[PDB]
Every structure is written in structure tokens, then in C-alpha cells.
Amino acid sequence: KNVVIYADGVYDMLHLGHMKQLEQAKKLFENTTLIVGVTSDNETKLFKGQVVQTLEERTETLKHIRWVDEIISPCPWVVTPEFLEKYKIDYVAHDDEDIYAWLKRAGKFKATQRTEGVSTTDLIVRILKN
Template identity: 45%
Template sequence: MSNCDPAHFSEDERAKEILRDCDYSIKINKELARSGKAPRQIRVYADGAFDLFHEGHANVLRQAKNCFPNVYLIVGVCSDATLNKMKGPTVMNDDERYNVVKHCRYVDEVLRDAPWEHNDAFIMDHKIDFFAHDDIPYISEGTEDIYGHLKKRDMFVATQRTEGVSTSDIITRMVRNYDVYARRNLARGYTSKELNISYHQQLLFKLQNIIESRQDFFRF
């Protein structure tokens, strides 16, 4: 039988063992990485929020995993505290986001509570050869692109976004069709308190569900 285990968290003993065994004194540039002749695995790091994990996220991680032959892909996932400060509230909490990334087939290791920016100490601690992210400048306080210093050092690999899908798009779709989803979940047993709607709205939605369930009777 085939066996495909989920990725390790960085603090797991197996991930620590792989890190210890990596001879980081062997420096790998892009030419050597692309040649397929690198004497060790190439450690590529990709990071993000990965909220409402979707095909766009998976596609980015696929690109990162396949940017060179023999890649060991480390994926950093930011915590709720970091994202609430830098971007705003998430839909999924950090444990949910850590675990969904852990079960993506392209990922070898997940770094929980990943930093927003990356200094030399972070690079050395995780023995990172290259960072993978889309090439759009990522503005943060005090810098026009948090990946800019990595691009200058030729440690950056550009990935492509998947057009037409993003976490913001999904949230927008949910908000636009809120009544439909609220009515569906009421029919499935959720309470007005859980859906954050008034008792009056609950009665209205239930009435709409009853009318729709009996609409055949009103056809002529």
C-alpha cells in the first residue's frame, strides 16, 4: 500500500534531524540549483496567511516545490496575532491554517507563527537557500518590499498567482450571498445566535425556506 504522510512541523524531531543533516556550508546559487546537480536538497521557503486555503494557495506551493529539482519546501504560516496586526482578522484560526497547509501534498515542513519579515538570523536558523513568492512588491512599515533585500541577493524565486481566485474573492462571494448561506445553515440546525442574526431575521429566513421548499405547489 502507498503511504503519504503529512508534512512535519518545524519543531518536530524529524524536521530538526533534516535541518541538522543539511550541510549549509555548501552554498547553492540558481545556476547550480537549476542544473539538478546540487549535492544536497535545496531548501526553499514560502510563506503566507493561507486563510480559506484554496487552489491558488496550492498552485503557489506547487510552483515553489517544483522551482528546482530536489526541493525541500518549508512553508511559513503567520499566526493570528501577526495577521490581525498587519492585515486584519482571519476567517480560519492559526491552528486550522497550520494544519490545512500541513496536509498539502507539496509541503515538506510547516513553520508555525512565521515572522512577517526575514532577517539573516532567520535565514541561517532555517538554512534557507531561496524564498518563493509572487513578484508583486509587498509593502510593509519602513520598506517598499519585504522581499526586496532577498531579490538583490538573488535568493528570490517568483511564483505566479492564480487569476480569479483569492481569499478576498471567496469572502466577497460569501458576503454577497449571505442570505442564502444563512438560510441554509438555519435549515441545518444552526441558531440565530451562532449566525449573529436577530430573531426577526431568523423567522424571515425560515419563512423563505418554507416557501422555496413548497414552490412546486405554486406553479401553474
């Protein structure tokens, strides 16, 4: 009955938006194991953009999050069909050409949603006003 969910991300400067998305992934089924993948510094910078926190710093915050059962750190930048078999992953949970088309084709994709404005970036934007 237990369903293995895989949620990968950069998880830089973790905020409420990330936490609610992890909650959503954890609660996709009644009984789950939520594995979180944390992207490497090099690949994040190479493919996405600057990261504030190191891999070690981003990974350590995640172990304090209620919803997180297991962590793969660093994780592969691109999910492969082989990765799913290796870790017995039933669904990939991530926000939504389409690099997820093959997961949806297989019935293994579970969309999760981000929250805007809750970001550590925005909180410093809110300050300074004084």
C-alpha cells in the first residue's frame, strides 16, 4: 500500500512555498515515502542559475522538514527511467519541449504547485521599506 514519491529540486533558501509543495507531494496517497532529490551546485549553476546555499546547506535544511522521509543528495539533474527502477519510485512529483511528457505518458507524473510571494527573496523586498 506504500507509494514511493520522488520530488527533486534545487531547494535554495527553503521557504513556505517549498514546504507546502513537499506537503502536497507527501500527501498524494494515504501511505507514502517521500524521497527528495537535491540538485548539485555545478549542474544548478550550469542549467538554471546562481544558487545562494551550497548543496550541503540546502540538504541539511531539508532533514528538518516534517514531510521529508528520505533524501538523495546530490540527485541527477535529469530523471531517467533507470533512476525510477533503481529507487523503486512510483511517481515523480514536481511543478509542471516537455521534459515531463514521458513521465505523464507512463502514468508516473504528479503535478505539484508552488506558492508565489512567500519567497525569501520577497521578504527582503518587503523590508528596506523602513
